[PDB]
DNA sequence: TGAAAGTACTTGAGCTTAGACA
RNA sequence: AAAGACCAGGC
DNA sequence: CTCAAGTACTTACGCCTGGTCATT
Protein backbone atom coordinates (compact mmCIF):
# COMPACT_ATOMS: atom_id res chain seq x y z
CA UNK A 1 0.00 0.00 0.00
CA UNK A 2 2.71 2.49 0.95
CA UNK A 3 5.18 1.76 -1.84
CA UNK A 4 2.87 1.22 -4.83
CA UNK A 5 -0.74 1.99 -3.96
CA UNK A 6 -0.20 5.49 -2.55
CA UNK A 7 1.90 6.60 -5.52
CA UNK A 8 -0.57 5.02 -7.95
CA UNK A 9 -3.48 6.86 -6.31
CA UNK A 10 -1.62 10.17 -6.33
CA UNK A 11 -0.49 9.92 -9.96
CA UNK A 12 -3.91 8.60 -11.02
CA UNK A 13 -5.90 11.61 -9.79
CA UNK A 14 -6.63 14.05 -12.65
CA UNK A 15 -4.70 17.32 -12.55
CA UNK A 16 -6.38 20.46 -11.24
CA UNK A 17 -7.74 22.38 -14.23
CA UNK A 18 -9.11 25.78 -13.27
CA UNK A 19 -9.71 29.14 -14.94
CA UNK A 20 -8.79 34.50 -18.34
CA UNK A 21 -5.78 32.73 -16.82
CA UNK A 22 -5.66 28.98 -16.30
CA UNK A 23 -3.86 27.11 -13.52
CA UNK A 24 -2.74 23.48 -13.75
CA UNK A 25 -1.57 21.48 -10.74
CA UNK A 26 0.23 18.15 -11.03
CA UNK A 27 1.48 15.79 -8.33
CA UNK A 28 4.78 14.14 -9.20
CA UNK A 29 5.91 11.72 -6.51
CA UNK A 30 5.14 11.05 -2.85
CA UNK A 31 7.79 10.79 -0.13
CA UNK A 32 7.54 8.82 3.11
CA UNK A 33 9.59 9.33 6.25
CA UNK A 34 9.95 7.49 9.53
CA UNK A 35 7.16 8.18 12.05
CA UNK A 36 7.99 11.53 13.64
CA UNK A 37 6.11 13.59 16.21
CA UNK A 38 5.71 17.37 16.04
CA UNK A 39 5.39 18.92 19.49
CA UNK A 40 3.76 22.26 20.32
CA UNK A 41 6.95 24.16 19.44
CA UNK A 42 7.03 22.27 16.13
CA UNK A 43 10.31 20.45 16.73
CA UNK A 44 10.36 17.11 14.86
CA UNK A 45 11.47 14.00 16.72
CA UNK A 46 11.12 10.25 16.10
CA UNK A 47 8.08 8.75 17.80
CA UNK A 48 8.57 5.32 19.13
CA UNK A 49 5.59 2.94 19.31
CA UNK A 50 5.88 2.60 23.09
CA UNK A 51 5.74 6.37 23.51
CA UNK A 52 2.77 6.39 21.14
CA UNK A 53 0.97 3.91 23.40
CA UNK A 54 1.85 5.74 26.60
CA UNK A 55 1.08 9.32 25.54
CA UNK A 56 -2.03 8.29 23.57
CA UNK A 57 -0.37 9.48 20.37
CA UNK A 58 -1.00 8.23 16.84
CA UNK A 59 1.87 6.27 15.30
CA UNK A 60 1.90 7.89 11.87
CA UNK A 61 4.37 9.22 9.33
CA UNK A 62 4.13 12.50 7.40
CA UNK A 63 3.39 12.28 3.68
CA UNK A 64 5.11 14.66 1.27
CA UNK A 65 4.29 14.94 -2.44
CA UNK A 66 6.07 17.03 -5.06
CA UNK A 67 3.64 19.42 -6.74
CA UNK A 68 4.27 21.48 -9.88
CA UNK A 69 2.15 24.62 -10.30
CA UNK A 70 1.85 25.98 -13.84
CA UNK A 71 0.20 29.33 -14.62
CA UNK A 72 -1.03 30.44 -18.04
CA UNK A 73 -1.26 34.22 -18.46
CA UNK A 74 -2.12 34.16 -22.21
CA UNK A 75 1.23 35.83 -22.99
CA UNK A 76 2.57 32.66 -24.63
CA UNK A 77 4.74 32.29 -21.51
CA UNK A 78 3.57 29.72 -18.97
CA UNK A 79 5.47 29.94 -15.69
CA UNK A 80 5.77 26.56 -13.95
CA UNK A 81 6.55 26.51 -10.22
CA UNK A 82 7.45 23.19 -8.60
CA UNK A 83 6.97 22.63 -4.86
CA UNK A 84 9.16 20.14 -3.00
CA UNK A 85 8.13 18.07 0.02
CA UNK A 86 4.60 19.46 0.17
CA UNK A 87 3.00 18.03 3.31
CA UNK A 88 -0.53 16.73 2.78
CA UNK A 89 -1.06 14.65 5.92
CA UNK A 90 0.13 11.86 8.16
CA UNK A 91 -0.45 8.19 7.32
CA UNK A 92 -0.65 5.76 10.26
CA UNK A 93 2.17 3.21 10.14
CA UNK A 94 1.59 -0.48 10.79
CA UNK A 95 4.09 -1.58 13.42
CA UNK A 96 7.15 -3.57 12.28
CA UNK A 97 6.38 -2.88 8.62
CA UNK A 98 9.10 -1.61 6.28
CA UNK A 99 8.50 2.05 7.16
CA UNK A 100 8.11 1.41 10.89
CA UNK A 101 10.90 2.50 13.21
CA UNK A 102 11.14 -1.07 14.56
CA UNK A 103 11.96 -2.58 11.17
CA UNK A 104 15.15 -4.60 10.99
CA UNK A 105 16.01 -4.21 14.68
CA UNK A 106 17.44 -7.19 16.55
CA UNK A 107 16.11 -8.55 19.85
CA UNK A 108 18.59 -6.47 21.85
CA UNK A 109 17.62 -3.34 19.92
CA UNK A 110 13.91 -3.95 20.54
CA UNK A 111 14.52 -4.55 24.25
CA UNK A 112 16.56 -1.34 24.50
CA UNK A 113 13.46 0.54 23.32
CA UNK A 114 11.14 -1.39 25.68
CA UNK A 115 9.50 -3.31 22.84
CA UNK A 116 8.83 -7.02 23.01
CA UNK A 117 10.94 -9.01 20.51
CA UNK A 118 8.13 -11.57 20.32
CA UNK A 119 5.61 -8.86 19.41
CA UNK A 120 4.51 -9.91 15.90
CA UNK A 121 3.58 -6.39 14.89
CA UNK A 122 1.17 -5.89 12.03
CA UNK A 123 -1.15 -3.52 13.91
CA UNK A 124 -1.66 0.24 14.06
CA UNK A 125 -1.40 2.56 17.06
CA UNK A 126 -4.07 5.28 17.10
CA UNK A 127 -4.41 7.55 20.14
CA UNK A 128 -2.42 4.97 22.09
CA UNK A 129 -4.77 2.12 21.19
CA UNK A 130 -3.53 -0.92 19.27
CA UNK A 131 -5.78 -1.36 16.22
CA UNK A 132 -5.69 -4.37 13.89
CA UNK A 133 -7.38 -4.41 10.50
CA UNK A 134 -9.52 -7.51 9.97
CA UNK A 135 -9.34 -8.95 6.46
C1' DT B 1 -22.63 -11.11 -2.40
C1' DG B 2 -26.39 -14.28 -1.22
C1' DA B 3 -30.58 -13.38 2.23
C1' DA B 4 -38.41 -13.81 3.55
C1' DA B 5 -42.99 -13.99 4.34
C1' DG B 6 -47.36 -12.16 5.17
C1' DT B 7 -50.33 -8.00 4.51
C1' DA B 8 -52.05 -3.29 3.48
C1' DC B 9 -52.86 -0.39 -0.31
C1' DT B 10 -54.00 1.00 -5.72
C1' DT B 11 -56.01 0.29 -10.56
C1' DG B 12 -57.78 -1.08 -14.19
C1' DA B 13 -59.91 -3.93 -16.53
C1' DG B 14 -64.18 -5.75 -18.77
C1' DC B 15 -69.55 -6.78 -21.51
C1' DT B 16 -74.74 -8.30 -27.25
C1' DT B 17 -79.13 -6.25 -28.67
C1' DA B 18 -82.75 -3.05 -30.58
C1' DG B 19 -88.89 -3.65 -31.62
C1' DA B 20 -95.21 -5.47 -31.38
C1' DC B 21 -98.41 -9.57 -24.95
C1' DA B 22 -100.81 -7.68 -18.16
C1' A C 1 -22.11 11.97 32.84
C1' A C 2 -26.06 11.30 30.90
C1' A C 3 -27.46 8.74 25.19
C1' G C 4 -26.08 6.46 21.27
C1' A C 5 -22.85 3.78 17.85
C1' C C 6 -19.50 -0.14 17.17
C1' C C 7 -16.61 -4.22 18.68
C1' A C 8 -15.14 -8.48 21.50
C1' G C 9 -16.85 -12.11 24.91
C1' G C 10 -19.95 -15.60 28.66
C1' C C 11 -24.25 -18.98 29.13
C1' DC D 1 -67.83 -2.49 -9.27
C1' DT D 2 -64.76 -6.15 -8.85
C1' DC D 3 -60.16 -8.94 -8.12
C1' DA D 4 -56.25 -10.51 -9.36
C1' DA D 5 -52.33 -8.35 -10.35
C1' DG D 6 -49.31 -5.77 -8.94
C1' DT D 7 -46.70 -2.51 -5.53
C1' DA D 8 -44.91 -0.74 -0.93
C1' DC D 9 -44.69 -1.87 4.05
C1' DT D 10 -43.42 -4.30 8.12
C1' DT D 11 -41.52 -7.39 10.82
C1' DA D 12 -37.92 -9.50 14.57
C1' DC D 13 -34.28 -11.72 17.87
C1' DG D 14 -33.17 -14.35 25.84
C1' DC D 15 -30.06 -12.32 29.57
C1' DC D 16 -25.10 -10.91 31.15
C1' DT D 17 -19.75 -8.79 30.96
C1' DG D 18 -16.06 -5.46 29.21
C1' DG D 19 -13.87 -2.04 25.99
C1' DT D 20 -13.45 2.25 22.60
C1' DC D 21 -15.26 6.61 20.47
C1' DA D 22 -16.99 10.99 18.88
C1' DT D 23 -20.06 14.41 20.49
C1' DT D 24 -22.44 16.75 23.89
* A90 neighbors A60 (Cβ within 8 angstroms): yes
Nucleic chain D contacts, protein chain A, residues 99-128, CB cut-off 7 A: 126-128
Q: How was this structure determined?
A: cryo-EM
Q: How far is the CA of A119 from the C1' of B9 (A)?
A: 62
Q: Which of A107, A106, A2, A119 is nearest to A49 (CA)?
A: A119
Q: Helices marked H in chain A — which ranges?
A: 5-12, 49-54, 107-112
- Resolution of the experimental structure, in angstroms: 3.2
Residues facing A124 on adjacent strands: A131
* A121 neighbors A93 (Cβ within 8 angstroms): no
Angle at A37 between CA A61 and CA A117, to 5 degrees: 70
- Give, as ranges, the nucleotides of chain D with any atom within 7 Å of a protein CB: 20-22
Neighbours of A124 (CB within 10 A): 19
Nucleotide nearest to A131 in CA–C1' terms: D20
| Cβ of A129 near strand D (distance < 7 A) | yes
Q: Helices marked H in A4-132 — which ranges?
A: 5-12, 49-54, 107-112
Angle at A80 between CA A78 and CA A81, to 5 degrees: 150
| Cβ of A10 near strand D (distance < 7 A) | no
Amino acid sequence: FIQMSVQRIVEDAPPIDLQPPRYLLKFEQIYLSKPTHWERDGAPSPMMPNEARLRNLTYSAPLYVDITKTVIKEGEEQLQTQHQKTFIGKIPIMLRSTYCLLNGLTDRDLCELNECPLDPGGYFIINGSEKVLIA
